[PDB]
Design a protein around this ligand. Structure first.
Ligand SMILES: [Ca+2]
Ligand SMILES: [Cl-]
Ligand SMILES: [Cl-]
Ligand SMILES: [Mg+2]
Length: 292
């Protein structure tokens, strides 16, 4: 019935999105991003779902390599010659970056095959799920699995704990101030062959886990959903760059090792170009109906 590597999310009706008092609170917690960077989570909406299955972990390097080994699959990033990595200053195209060269030519997996696979395009993700006899999760399925049957900021509750997940809150906390974290980000990314900052799937289990058992629904890597970017209501108004991708980008969830706490909440929405774009911080996990 239920594959040992998935968990059953019980059917029910939940409130998708984030309430006004949460947005107010993001205003007040000295967050850079203005209010209209979070309004795409609003208004909350009643979403009804059946029981459904979702992977416990993100797809690992090792699992994707089995897919590639058996099928010969070639990823978008390999056909293009490159993929995106965040450099010293901004996002950059890195020649040779792909799932097995996560920092480009001169890098490799180096025994980190229990980490989530990255440089996965939307089509790379859909193809692996087909092969596995599964699919991507919808955004609704993803958020439900993350927040639980009632609303909460992070999968473990409403109180932040940098020890519960792979985010930049841990690393900045360890370096002592936000100055020292910027100075660090400099010194590592200055060529210096950037050490990967992903973590093995399930490394922060069980403390970081969601109520239903999903691991790493916070931080580590961004995750594709199958959902086409859409507003929760026709009157929602966000930053123009967000309307620009409405109706064409696919929703990306969960934040990444690079994010701080406000960009890795259960309800946070990101968006990605589904036509052969990928980056070194973006992977996925699968879902499935209870009955294929
Ligand atoms: Ca967002
Ligand atoms: Cl952030
Ligand atoms: Cl299915
Ligand atoms: Mg994530």
């Amino acid at each position: 019935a239920v594959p040992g590597d998935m968990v059953r999310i019980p059917g029910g009706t939940f409130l998708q999105g984030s309430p006004e008092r949460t947005l107010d609170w993001l205003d007040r917690e000295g967050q850079a991003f203005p209010r209209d960077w979070f309004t795409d989570e609003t208004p909350q909406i009643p979403v009804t779902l059946p029981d459904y299955l979702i992977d416990r972990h993100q797809v690992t390097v090792a699992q994707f390599a089995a897919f590639v080994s058996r099928t010969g699959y070639v990823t978008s990033a390999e056909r293009a010659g490159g993929s995106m990595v965040y450099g010293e200053q901004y996002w950059e195209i890195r020649e040779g970056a792909c799932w097995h060269r996560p920092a480009g030519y001169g890098s490799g997996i180096r025994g980190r095959d229990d980490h989530p696979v990255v440089h996965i395009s939307f089509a790379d993700a859909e193809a692996y799920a087909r092969w596995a006899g599964r699919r991507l999760p919808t955004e609704s399925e993803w958020e439900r699995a993350a927040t639980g049957p009632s609303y909460r900021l992070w999968p473990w509750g409403d109180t932040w704990d940098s020890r519960n997940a792979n985010t930049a809150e841990h690393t900045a906390g360890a370096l002592g101030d936000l100055d020292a974290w910027r100075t660090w980000w400099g010194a590592i990314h200055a060529v210096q062959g950037p050490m990967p900052q992903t973590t093995p799937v399930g490394a922060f289990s069980p403390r970081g886990d969601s109520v239903d058992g999903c691991a790493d629904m916070t931080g580590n890597v961004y995750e594709w959903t199958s959902t086409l970017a859409h507003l929760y209501s026709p009157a929602t108004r966000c930053d123009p760059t967000i309307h620009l991708v409405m109706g064409r980008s696919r929703v990306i969830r969960g934040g990444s090792w690079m994010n701080f706490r406000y960009q890795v909440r259960c309800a946070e929405r990101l968006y990605g170009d589904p036509t052969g774009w990928s980056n070194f911080a973006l992977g996925f996990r699968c879902a499935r109906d209870v009955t294929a």
